[PDB]
Structures are given as structure tokens and as C-alpha cells.
Amino acid sequence: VNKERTFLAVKPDGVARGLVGEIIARYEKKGFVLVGLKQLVPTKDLAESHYAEHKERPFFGGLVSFITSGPVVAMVFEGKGVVASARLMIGVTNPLASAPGSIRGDFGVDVGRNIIHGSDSVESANREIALWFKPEELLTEVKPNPNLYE
Amino acid sequence: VNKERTFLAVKPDGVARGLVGEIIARYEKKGFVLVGLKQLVPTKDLAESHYAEHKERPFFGGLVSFITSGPVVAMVFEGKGVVASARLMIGVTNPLASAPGSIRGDFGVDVGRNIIHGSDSVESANREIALWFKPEELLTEVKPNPNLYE
Amino acid sequence: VNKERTFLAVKPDGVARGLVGEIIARYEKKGFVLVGLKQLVPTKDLAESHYAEHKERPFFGGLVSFITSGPVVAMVFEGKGVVASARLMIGVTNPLASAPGSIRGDFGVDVGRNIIHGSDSVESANREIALWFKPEELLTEVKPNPNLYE
Amino acid sequence: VNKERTFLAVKPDGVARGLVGEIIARYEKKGFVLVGLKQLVPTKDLAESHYAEHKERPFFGGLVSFITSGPVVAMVFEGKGVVASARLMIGVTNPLASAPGSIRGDFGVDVGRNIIHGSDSVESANREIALWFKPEELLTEVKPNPNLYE
Amino acid sequence: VNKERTFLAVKPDGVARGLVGEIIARYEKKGFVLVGLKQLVPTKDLAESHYAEHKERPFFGGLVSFITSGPVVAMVFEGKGVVASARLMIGVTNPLASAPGSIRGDFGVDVGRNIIHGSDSVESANREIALWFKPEELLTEVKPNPNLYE
Amino acid sequence: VNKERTFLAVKPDGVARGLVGEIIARYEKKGFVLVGLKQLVPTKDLAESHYAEHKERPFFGGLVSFITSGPVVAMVFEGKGVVASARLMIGVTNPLASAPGSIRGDFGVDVGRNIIHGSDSVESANREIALWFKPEELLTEVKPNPNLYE
Ligand SMILES: Nc1ncnc2c1ncn2[C@@H]1O[C@H](COP(=O)(O)OP(=O)(O)O)[C@@H](O)[C@H]1O
Ligand SMILES: Nc1ncnc2c1ncn2[C@@H]1O[C@H](COP(=O)(O)OP(=O)(O)O)[C@@H](O)[C@H]1O
Ligand SMILES: Nc1ncnc2c1ncn2[C@@H]1O[C@H](COP(=O)(O)OP(=O)(O)O)[C@@H](O)[C@H]1O
Ligand SMILES: Nc1ncnc2c1ncn2[C@@H]1O[C@H](COP(=O)(O)OP(=O)(O)O)[C@@H](O)[C@H]1O
Ligand SMILES: Nc1ncnc2c1ncn2[C@@H]1O[C@H](COP(=O)(O)OP(=O)(O)O)[C@@H](O)[C@H]1O
Ligand SMILES: Nc1ncnc2c1ncn2[C@@H]1O[C@H](COP(=O)(O)OP(=O)(O)O)[C@@H](O)[C@H]1O
Ligand SMILES: [Mg+2]
Ligand SMILES: [Mg+2]
Ligand SMILES: [Mg+2]
Ligand SMILES: [Mg+2]
Ligand SMILES: [Mg+2]
Ligand SMILES: [Mg+2]
């Protein structure tokens, strides 16, 4: 159904490079509806619980360090199959392997400076949305373009 | 040679969403030549003949109903391998499964609101071109940029 | 009411340079609705009545021969103040003097190869629309984006 | 100095039309730095104090009514001469009179559905920023592209 | 005729900000032909000769220092009225006062970091072209799209 | 270290169709740094050594005559994995089989008119770079966007 939601965040590098609008426009053009949006500098606690699944990984320290080094634009998009779709639009972990047309493929060059984060499953999205957004910062009733769904 | 032709149609959703020029420009930039172009509100007979191969499918009634609910911009492009190349540019039937960079991948979310129709083979193109366009509405003399072909 | 219409034509040079889609997209983004659209090769009779006010001018002969020299995509847009607005978007007669952001300013360099034509008044528009299009070729039910008008 | 700030808001119509990213990208490309961003549905009280200077005007009721009818993306951009510059980039009150290249000129057609609001002076900006944003939602230390300022 | 030429240079800020292709594409779309193109780090002698008319101005020292701090992409375009048309596309000296749609208007904020240099007259163009380009680095045979000129 | 370089050349058809800027912009957005750039008309000697691995092929004769038939803009980009990445961005040899989003996929239709050349390995790149550019024509101090690399 047309009510699935995913969490996306323009990372510090994406924000410093002036890519916020370009990224949001891709999702709007696709037809997803913005239900949550804000800019904040992540707190070390937010970053660690956000990337909690990687806590025992070698790159964890630098990641948390990086994500907390500058502003991040956090957003939640709503639509049919938005979690898997937003991932397809993002590309793969290494931007060098990401196909042109995707966000990482078009703008990235390094795994550690890969512009944007996207939830990889509905469980993660629900978990991540709850982590970054309060219920009052999310639109309750969404009304998409009527020409989008049958 | 480079005289192959295909029939493409911006469906009512694509027209209402203001995507006609975006779609046309994609094919012009590729190097394909426009030999026919018109806007019309398809009739139920045209809709049913156009999609005759799906007349037994559960979605036919709704397809035909949607294709006739509003204006469509019908067009025919010419150039080498245009039938298969235009399909590649369109994406796949389900927009969510279409790669970023393709038309359906970039703009659609629902199978039923997938923006554009493109002939799936040369035999289909000939059938669909004859169905939507009268002979005199098609350019007889075509001239593609001279830097496109060897 | 905001049902004003203007006639626009992408001239043979505009069509040859692959600017049809780009031009249509500018009017679609603006919010105007396409109510008639077709590609054809103008007849001398048509070109001569179209540019009737210019017969005593030295460029008339060249003008007519050029407009009848290849495909032209003809269209009629509808919307509040479309006539004057589409003119502002086109630029001025000399493309070199047209401001960057207008169609002629962005794409043209010569007065005789100035990409597009637009009616200059509602009187000229009604007259030109009836010249290029038969009544049944124009949409009767116009449904513009509901976010466009108050 | 490079520390002036202005308040911009993508109005409900701009948000429903999928223009948020396109608008933010124009300001990022210009070099202004985003210091505040959020989406919210305005409260009738916020709207009235925001447009307080028009309280005795005929259109006031519909404006407040409209601004409160759907989500608005509120933002504050920082840079040298950003208040007057953002206005120039926005266009004039009536989008029909706005030049192509500006936001209203490119996307608008009606005075009441003019896509975006921008502070008209530094006094208004300071007043409006304070109205929509809490001090903790604004970046304190801004670091622009070093290639932007001498 | 259409053999007029102008010298344009993407300054070090424009190069560092990744605006070279955007700038070149603007002139290619207009219909101007590239007859010379190179990237070089200007020498202090070149910088001072190029900007000789400003040698008494308080900002000369800093101008020359900036123009030599990094790579510049020097280029020459040919076409009818290219000198004045390219200036119009560039904007005015102060980017904040440049109209949206022009290069400086769209991308710059500081007079000292205004992205691009364009010759201000034919006499200046001839001087600057001879100063930055050796004869053999310029195309002798130029061929503009045949749909550009009457 | 991430100082890998690749040689790219916009072929005469790419230059004639006005795609130089568009092509450069794709590599600039990606984060790669232009370290050499020039426009020239290739000499038969140069074209023949460039495409040396193809002398026994039936298309070699046509290939060489074409590359020496008009201006070519030559360039060298530097960045992490630039060689393989620029190839992914180019597409494949047959433009019709290149995926939408790649340069050849977006703009080409014929194998012999495929817009751009890119080195296929670091070995070929070092070899091609030394063929088209003298050492002093290439930047020595490379300062990429600091947000690009870890
Ligand atoms: N081996 C690695 N080296 C450096 N940083 C890494 C590595 N793999 C993961 N990262 C970083 O960690 C973030 C979370 O990683 P992961 O969840 O595996 O990928 P994705 O972000 O694509 O979901 C990635 O976006 C990336 O910035
Ligand atoms: N299972 C489905 N549910 C609803 N509509 C469908 C479905 N499959 C196809 N359609 C609609 O039928 C149109 C025709 O289908 P088909 O010819 O299979 O695909 P394509 O349009 O990609 O050639 C589709 O483009 C879509 O609008
Ligand atoms: N001095 C001229 N020389 C050549 N062609 C001209 C001249 N003046 C006008 N034209 C051509 O005649 C067309 C119609 O003229 P006019 O109605 O004056 O301009 P517009 O097209 O801006 O309304 C022009 O668009 C241009 O193609
Ligand atoms: N006469 C009018 N008719 C309808 N609504 C109006 C009128 N003038 C002002 N408005 C609306 O009120 C908002 C605030 O108006 P104003 O401050 O005058 O213009 P601006 O928004 O350009 O600063 C405008 O953006 C517009 O939506
Ligand atoms: N008052 C100023 N302060 C600092 N730099 C200036 C000033 N005026 C001009 N400049 C710098 O000098 C360059 C040359 O100036 P000028 O020839 O007057 O303008 P333009 O570059 O628009 O032709 C400008 O483009 C800008 O970089
Ligand atoms: N079958 C062919 N017919 C015509 N031209 C060809 C053919 N194969 C290759 N070419 C031309 O030769 C150029 C160099 O060939 P190759 O190295 O195989 O491809 P690529 O350019 O993708 O690396 C091609 O880019 C294309 O211009
Ligand atoms: Mg992950
Ligand atoms: Mg089908
Ligand atoms: Mg006229
Ligand atoms: Mg106001
Ligand atoms: Mg000057
Ligand atoms: Mg090769």
C-alpha cells in the first residue's frame, strides 16, 4: 500500500557540497511525498544508535565521527514501495560501483563520503524514523498527486 | 537502416503531471527524429484495440478506462534500433522496479500509472502507428542531425 | 475566466535543433495546459496567412520559405494571462537582445532563426489558433493543476 | 558582511507541486548556506503574526486560510546580501510579471498561488526568523564554500 | 558577419566549484562555437596584463593574486554579436546585482569571486585573445549548426 | 593514493552536437578534477597511435578519418578509481545498448558516432595521457573538494 515510509538523510558531505535540493527533487519527481524534514547536527548518541548494527565493525568510529561533524538534513518520504525504491535510487555502498542515474553514482567517489543514507528495510525505516523524528514533526494525513496511484 | 519507427504515448497521468516535454526531450537528445505528434483523448475503441492483447487480463477494464479518461500525446520516432532503445529508456512495466535514469524509474510509482507506453517490437510498432496515425500525419522526409550516423 | 489561449509554434530551426521538448517543458512547469498539439509541414497558404501582417516587409519572402521548409510543432496553451506571459518567456524578436532565461535568449543568435513563434495579443491568438487547428483538435475539458489557481 | 540571513518558505502550493528541492537547489547553487529547515503545517496564529502587516488588507483572510491549509517548508539561508538577493531570485508578487529565471516567473501563474515567500528586508527577516524558528534549530557556526568569499 | 569572437575565462573559483561544464554548455546551447579551449594556471605577468586597465585600483593586487592562485579555463567563442551577448549571459560585475538566469546571477555572491570573465568589447576581445592564445590553438575553420544563421 | 588519471576525449560528433559542457559537467558533479584540457584537430599520426590496438580491424580506416575530421576536446580527470568509473559513466561501445544515465546511452545511436572516448585501463590511460598532453600542460597541485574524500 501507498503508506510505507522510509528514512533518508543527506549526510554532512552531501550538505556541504550543496546537494540537498537536488536529492529532494529526485524523490519529489518520483512521486514520493515528504512527511518529515529538518536539519540538525547529529548528537554522538543519535549517531551510535542510528548505526548500532555496525558497532562491532572497523569503520564504526570514523562513521560516527563523520556523521556528527556537520549538519545533516533528515527526511521521511511516503509512498508505495518507498524503502526499496529509495535504495535503488541511492545506489550501492561504494559510489564508484553505483550506476549513473543513482545518487551515489552521480555524485560520489568514496565509501566514507557517500552523500546519503537510506533505510534498508521497513523494520529499519520504522526504527530509524522513530529515532530521528517526534510524532508531531510527521504529517499525519498525506495527500499525494492523484495522478500517481490507481 | 535508420528508418525504423516506434509508437510512444504519454498516458493521461504523464500529461496531467506535466511530463510531456521532459519525455520528448529525452528522445530528441538521444538523436531520434519525431515523425508524428498529436494530442487526442483516446476513444474506447482505440484504447481497446491498442491494448487488445490484454483483453482477458483482469486489469484491462481499468486500463482502458484510464487511457480514455484524458488526453494522451501520441508520437512516433524514427532512428536505428528505436523500438528496443525506446523500451530501454522507458524502463519496465512496474516503475518501482525501473532503474533510475529511465522514464518510469525516474517518475512513476504505480504499475497502473506508469506514464508512458512504448511499442514492444517492430511488428507492434507498425500496428500501433497505423492505429493512431493517418498516413498524412507522418513525415515522409526525415532528416536526423548529420553527426548521428556513420 | 482564466481560459485564455495562445498559439505557439516551434519553428523548423527549433525542431531541427531538438528543442521541442525543452520548449514544451518550460510552459508545463509554468502551469499552462496544452489544449492542442501537432507536428506538420506548413503550406505556403498557411505560412502566408499566418504572417499576413508582414507581407510589405523585405523579410516576408524569406520568412514564408523558411516556415514551409520543414516540420513545425504547433500548440495551444491555456491559462491565466498566457498570451503576454508566453511572450515574456519567449523573449524578443532579436534573440541576441533576449534576456538569459527566455527561450530566444537561451538558444538563439539570429533574427531569422529565432526558434519559436508566439501570438502577440489575444486577438492575434484567436486568429492564429483558428488558422492552424480545427475545433475538434482542441481540448474541451481543461483540468489544470488544482494548486495553480485560487 | 557574509552573515546576513533571510527567511524563505515554500508555500503549500509549492510543496504540493513538488518544487521544494528545485527551490532549495537554486539557493545552494547561488552559494547561500542553509542554517534552518523544517516542514510544518502553519498554525492560524503563526500565519497571522507572519503576515501581520497585511491584517487590514482585502486578501488577508484568504492568505491566512491558504497558508494554513497544508504543509509549508520553512528555511533560513545565510550569506552576503541574501535578503535582497533571495527576493530578486523570487521575482515579484504576481508570478505573471516575474521574469523567466526567477522562481515565480518559472513556476507561477496566480498572485494567490505564488509558490514561495521571502523576507523583504533585514528587519522583516529577523522578525520572521524569530517567529518560525527556535534558536536551537539554527546553525550557530556557518562555514560556506571557501571559494565563495574574498 | 558571424565571425566575431570573444574571450571568456572561468576563474579559479568557478573551476574549484565545478562550474566549467555548466558554463560551457550555456554558450554551446546558445549556438556559439568554441574555437579555443585550455586550462592553465595564469602567471603573474599574464594576470597583470589581462587586467592592466585596473592597475591603479585598490583591488588590483588582490585580483591578480586570486586569478593566479589556481587553474583557469580560458576559451574563445565565435558567432554573431558574441561579445555583447556573452556579457549579457555573464551578468554584471557584482553577482548579487545580476539577474537570475545569468551566470553570475545564478552562482555568485561576492564581487571578488564572480566566477567568470568575459571581454567587454571587440577591441578588448582581440587584445585578450592574443594575450592568452597562440594562433595555432585557435580553430581556423569554424562550423556552427546550419540552423543557427539565415 | 587517489591520484589515478584517465584520458577522455569528446569526439568530433560530440563537439559538433554541442555536448562538451554537458559531458564535462557530469565528471565535475562526480567529484573528479580536471587536470588537463584542450581543444585541437587530431593529426592522422595521433589518431593512428591513439587507436593503435585497432589497426587490423575493418573500422580502423573510418575511425581515424573521423577523429581527424574536426575538433576534439581532450581532457584528463583525476580521482579515486577514475578510469573504471569514467567508463561506467560513458556506457558501452554500442550507444543503443548503453543504459540510460550513461553518456552514450543518453546521446548516441550509432557505434561509429559514439560521442566520447575514455581510457579502458590505467595502462591505456597513462599511455594515452602521454600521447595527447605534454607534461607541463597538466596540473601538478590537485586540490579536490575536501568533502569528497575520507
Ligand atoms: N569498509 C568500509 N569502509 C569505510 N566506511 C564504510 C565501509 N562500509 C560501510 N561504510 C560506511 O558506513 C555506512 C553504513 O554502512 P552500510 O549500512 O553497510 O551501507 P549503506 O549505507 O549502503 O546502507 C555506509 O554508508 C558507509 O558510509
Ligand atoms: N498487473 C497489472 N496491474 C495493473 N495494470 C497493469 C498490470 N500489468 C500491466 N498493467 C498496465 O497495462 C499496461 C500494459 O501492460 P504491458 O504491455 O504488459 O506493459 P508495458 O506497458 O510495459 O508494455 C501497463 O503499461 C500498465 O499500465
Ligand atoms: N529584420 C528582420 N529580418 C529577418 N527576419 C525578421 C526580421 N524581423 C522579423 N523577422 C522574422 O519575422 C518573424 C515575425 O516577425 P515579428 O512578428 O516582428 O516578431 P515576433 O516573432 O517576435 O513576434 C520574426 O520572428 C523573425 O523570424
Ligand atoms: N491583491 C492581491 N490579491 C490576492 N492575494 C494577494 C494580493 N497581494 C498580495 N497577495 C498575497 O499576499 C502575500 C503577501 O503579499 P506581499 O507581501 O504584498 O507580496 P510578497 O509576497 O511578494 O512579499 C503575497 O505573496 C500574495 O500571495
Ligand atoms: N570594487 C571591487 N572590489 C573588488 N574586486 C572588484 C571590484 N570591481 C571589480 N572587481 C574584480 O575585478 C574584476 C574585473 O573588474 P571589471 O572589469 O570592472 O568587471 P567585469 O569583470 O564585470 O568586466 C571583476 O570581475 C571582479 O573580480
Ligand atoms: N563495429 C564497429 N563499427 C564501427 N565503429 C566501431 C566498431 N567497433 C568499434 N568502433 C569504433 O571504434 C572506437 C574504439 O573502439 P573500442 O576501443 O572497441 O570501443 P570503446 O570506445 O568503447 O573503448 C569505438 O568507440 C567506435 O567509435
Ligand atoms: Mg545501512
Ligand atoms: Mg505493452
Ligand atoms: Mg509576431
Ligand atoms: Mg511580503
Ligand atoms: Mg572587465
Ligand atoms: Mg577503446
Half-sphere exposure of C114 (CA within 13 A, CB side): 19
Closest CA to B46 of B138, B133, B139: B133
Asked if the Cβ–Cβ distance from F85 to A16 is below 8 Å, we say no
The span from the CA of B76 to the CA of B104, in Å, is: 19
Sheet holding B116-118, edge to edge: B116-118, B5-10, B72-78, B33-40, C33-40, C72-78, C5-10, C116-118
First vs last C-alpha separation in chain B: 11
Residue with cell 570514523: A62
CB of C114 within 6 A of ligand 3: the answer is yes
The closest residue, in CA terms, to atom 11 on ligand 5 is E112
Nearest to C28 among B21, B34, B39 (CB): B21
User: Which of E16, E114, E119 is CA-nearest to residue E59?
Assistant: E114
Measured between alpha carbons, how far is B106 from B97 in angstroms, rounded to an integer? Answer: 11
CA atoms within 13 A on the CB side of A142: 20
How far CA C53 is from CA of C48, C49, C63, C117, E4, in Å, comes to 9, 8, 12, 14, 33
Bridge partner list, A102:
A100
Contact between C48 and C107 (Cβ < 8 Å)? no
**Contacting residues of B for F105, CB less than 8 Å apart:** 88, 101
Cell readout for A105 is 553514482
Is the CB of residue B50 less than 8 Å from the CB of residue B67? yes
Query: And the C-alpha cell for B129?
Result: 502507428
Bridge partner residues of A6 (DSSP): A77
Helix spans in chain A (H): 12-16, 20-30, 44-50, 60-67, 82-90, 103-107, 122-132
* Encoded amino acid at C69, one letter: S
Nearest bound ligand to the CA of residue F111:
6
**Cα B102–chain centre separation:** 13
Chain E nearest-CA distance from D23, in A, is: 12
- DSSP secondary structure code for residue A23 in this structure: H
Q: Environment class of residue F90 by beta-carbon count within 10 Å: exposed (0-12), middle (13-18) or buried (19+)?
A: buried
Instruction: Look up cell 588519471; give the residue.
Output: F5
- Alpha helix stretches (DSSP H) within B33-139: 44-50, 60-67, 82-90, 103-107, 122-132
Name the nearest CA neighbour of F100 among B95, B101, B92, B31.
B101
Solved using: X-ray
Task: Give CA separation, E50 vs C141, E11, F32, in Å.
Answer: 61, 13, 29
Buried b (16+ CB within 10 A) or exposed e, B9-32: bbbbbbbbbbbbbbbbbbbbbbbb
Identify which of F6, F51, F59, F127 to mutate to test ligand 6's pocket (most ligand atoms within 8 A of the CB).
Answer: F59
CA E20 to the chain's CA centroid: 11
Is the CB of residue E39 less than 8 Å from the CB of residue F34? yes
Residue A103 CA to residue A29 CA, distance in Å, equals: 14
> F29 CB near a chain A CB, below 8 Å?
yes
| Contact of E14 with E20, CB cutoff 8 Å | yes
Say if residues E13 and D147 touch (Cβ distance below 8 Å).
yes
Q: Please report how the helices E20-30 and F20-30 are oriented relative to each other, as an axis angle in degrees rounded to 10.
A: 160
Residue bearing cell 554579436: E81
Rounded to 5 degrees, φ, ψ at D109 are -140, -15
* Amino acid at site B65: S
What CATH architecture is D1-150? 2-Layer Sandwich (3.30)
Residue type, A18: G
Written as nine digits, the cell of F7 is 584520458
Q: Do D28 and A20 touch (CB under 8 A)?
A: yes
Of all ligands present, the nearest one to the C-alpha of E58 is 5
* Interface residue F80 vs chain A (CB under 8 A): yes
What is the DSSP code (8-state) at residue A22? H
F50 labelled catalytic = no
Residue B47 sits at the vertex; the CA angle it makes with B46 and B53, to the nearest 5 degrees, is: 105
Where does residue B122 rank: exposed (0-12), middle (13-18), buried (19+ CB within 10 A)?
A: middle
Scanning C37-76 for CB atoms below 8 A from D yields none
Identity at D124, one-letter amino acid code? S
Instruction: Determine the Cα–Cα distance for residues D12 and D123; give it in Å rounded to an integer.
Output: 25
- A26, C106, D28, E18, E142 from D25: Cα distances, Å: 12, 20, 5, 15, 36
Q: For residue A112, report the distance from its CA to the centre of ligand 1, in Å.
A: 7
- The amino acid present at E110, given as its one-letter code, is D
Radius of gyration, alpha carbons of chain F: 15
Separation of alpha carbons B41 and B12, rounded Å: 9
CA atoms within 13 A on the CB side of A56: 1
CA-to-CA distance for E56 and D132, rounded, in angstroms? Answer: 48
Q: Does E11 count as an annotated binding residue? A: yes
The response to whether residue D120 sits with its C-beta less than 6 Å from ligand 4 reads yes
Q: Which residues contact C56 (CB under 8 A, 6 or more apart)?
A: none
Q: Would you call F136 helix, strand, or coil by DSSP?
A: helix
Distance CA(D64)–CA(C148), nearest Å, equals: 17
Residues in chain C within 8 Å Cβ distance of D109: 30-32, 79-81, 85, 148-149
Q: Where are the alpha helices (DSSP H) in E31-108?
A: 44-50, 60-67, 82-90, 103-107
Please, are residues E3 and C109 in contact by the beta-carbon 8 Å criterion? no
C-alpha cell recorded at residue E104: 553570475
Residue type, E14: G
* Reduced 3-state DSSP string for D17-60: CCCHHHHHHHHHHHCCEEEEEEEECCCHHHHHHHCHHHCCCCCH
HEC secondary structure over D70-119: CCEEEEEEECCCHHHHHHHHHCCCCHHHCCECEHHHHHCCECCECCEEEC
CB atoms within 10 A of CB E141: 8
Report whether A19 contacts A115 (CB < 8 A): yes
Radius of gyration of chain C (CA): 15
Annotated binding site of B for ATP: 11, 59, 87, 93, 104, 114
Residue with cell 504519454: B10
Helices (H) and strands (E) in chain E, counts: 7, 4
Comparing alpha-carbon positions, the chain F residue that sits nearest to B99 is F100
If one counts every other C-beta atom within 10 angstroms of the C-beta of residue A133, the result is 18
- Closest by Cα among E128, A111, E105 to D91: E105
Nearest CA to D8 out of D140, D135, D114 is that of D114
Nearest-5° angle of CA F113, CA F118, CA F120? 120
In A33-61, which positions are buried (b, 16+ CB within 10 angstroms) versus exposed (e)?
bbbbbbbbebeeebbbebbeeeeeeeebe
Please give the backbone phi and psi of residue D142, each rounded to the nearest 5 degrees, phi first.
-105, 140
Give the Cα separation of D17 and C149 in Å (integer): 12
CB contact under 8 A, C110 and E145: no
Closest CB to B17 among A2, A102, A145: A145
Break chain D into its structural domains and give their ranges: 1-150
Give chain F's end-to-end CA distance (angstroms, integer): 12
How many whole angstroms separate alpha carbon B31 and alpha carbon B43? 32
- Compute the distance between CA of residue B29 and CA of residue E31 in angstroms, rounded to an integer: 16
Binding residues of D for ATP: 11, 59, 87, 93, 104, 114
Question: Resolution (in Å) of the shown entry?
Answer: 2.0
CA-CA distance, F35 to D122, in Å (whole number)?
43
CB of residue C6 inside a 6 A radius of ligand 3: no
The answer to whether E29 and C107 have CB atoms below 8 angstroms apart is yes
Q: Which residues, in sequence order, are bridge partners of residue A77?
A: A6, A34
Answer whether B4 touches A (CB < 8 Å). Answer: no
Check if the beta carbon of residue C88 is closer than 8 Å to that of residue D99: yes
Which element (helix H / strand E) includes F40?
Answer: strand F33-40
CB A55 within 8 A of CB D54: no
- Alpha-carbon distance C90 to A23, whole Å? 30
Quick one: which atom of ligand 2 is closest to the CA of B117? 21
Give the DSSP H/E element, type plus range, for residue B75.
Answer: strand B72-78
Say if the Cβ atoms of B85 and F96 lie within 8 Å.
yes
Pairwise CB contact (< 8 Å): C96 & E89: no
**Strand, helix or coil for residue D11:** coil
* Cell numbers placing B111: 504499475
One-letter amino acid at C26 equals R
Determine the distance separating the centroid of ligand 3 and the alpha carbon of C94, expressed in angstroms.
8
Torsion of CA A32, A37, A40, A43, to 10 degrees: -70
The partner residues of F77 in beta bridges, in order of sequence, read: F6, F34
CA-CA distances (angstroms) from residue E102 to C31, E112, E115, F127?
23, 17, 12, 40
Max intra-chain CA distance, chain A: 47
Beta carbons of B76 and B5 less than 8 angstroms apart: yes
Beta carbons of D139 and A18 less than 8 Å apart: no
Ligand 4 lined by D98 (C-beta under 6 Å): no
Whether chain C has a CB inside 8 Å of the CB on B28: the answer is yes
Q: Give the three cell numbers for residue C32.
A: 499552462
The whole-angstrom separation of Cα B79 and Cα B82 is 5
Q: How far is CA C95 from CA C7, C23, D100, in A?
A: 20, 15, 15
Grid cell of A120 as nine digits: 534498508
8 A C-beta contact, residue F125 and residue F86: no
SS3 F76: strand
Distance CA E120, CA E104 (A): 15
- C-alpha to C-alpha distance for C99 and C90, rounded to whole angstroms: 9
Name the residue with cell 514533526: A137
Which residues surround ligand 5 with Cβ inside 6 Å?
A: E 59, 63, 93, 111-112, 114, 117, 120
Q: Given CB atoms, is A32 within the 8 Å cutoff of chain B?
A: yes
F80 touches F149 (CB < 8 A): yes
Per-residue DSSP letter, E4: -
Instruction: Please list every residue in chain E whose beta carbon sits closer than 8 Å to the beta carbon of residue C17.
Output: 145, 147
Q: Is C114 annotated as a binding residue?
A: yes
| Count of Cβ atoms closer than 10 Å to residue C9 Cβ | 23
Cα–Cα distance for residue pair D114/B25, rounded to 1 Å: 27
| Count of residues making up chain F | 150
Question: What residue type is D72 in one-letter code?
Answer: V
Which of the ligands is closest to the CA of residue F11? 6
Report yes or no: A30 and B109 within 8 Å, Cβ to Cβ: yes
Neighbours of C142 (CB within 10 A): 15
Cα–Cα distance measured from residue B35 to residue D20, given in angstroms and rounded to the nearest whole number: 36
Hey, what's the cell of F147? Answer: 568533502
Contact between A150 and B66 under an 8 Å Cβ cutoff? The reply is yes
Q: In this structure, is the dihedral angle defined by the CA atoms of residues A120, A126, A127 and A133, taken in order, positive or negative?
A: positive
Q: Nearest Cα to F82, choosing from F136, F137, F142, F134? A: F142
Assigned C-alpha cell, C139: 481540448
Helix intervals (H) in chain F: 12-16, 20-30, 44-50, 60-67, 82-90, 103-107, 122-132
* C-alpha radius of gyration, chain A, whole number: 15
The amino acid that residue D34 corresponds to is L
The grid coordinates of residue E84 equal: 555583447
List D95, D98, D115, D117, catalytic entry? D117
3-state secondary structure of C34: strand
- Name which of E86, E105, E115 is nearest E12 in CA terms: E115
Q: For the residues of F5-21, what is the DSSP string, one character each?
A: EEEEEE-HHHHHTT-HH
Determine which residue's CA is closest to atom 14 belonging to ligand 4.
D51
Candidates C32, C102, C147; nearest CB to D113: C147
Quote the distance between the C-alpha of residue D147 and its chain's center: 25
| Counts for chain B of helices (H) and strands (E), in that order | 7, 4
Task: Please list every residue in chain A whose beta carbon sits closer than 8 Å to the beta carbon of residue F79.
Answer: 109
* Contact indicator for A77, A71 with CB cutoff of 8 Å: no
- In chain C, how many H helices and how many E strands? 7, 4
d(Cα D145, Cα A110) in Å, to the nearest integer? 20
| B21/C20 touch (CB, cutoff 8 Å), yes or no | yes
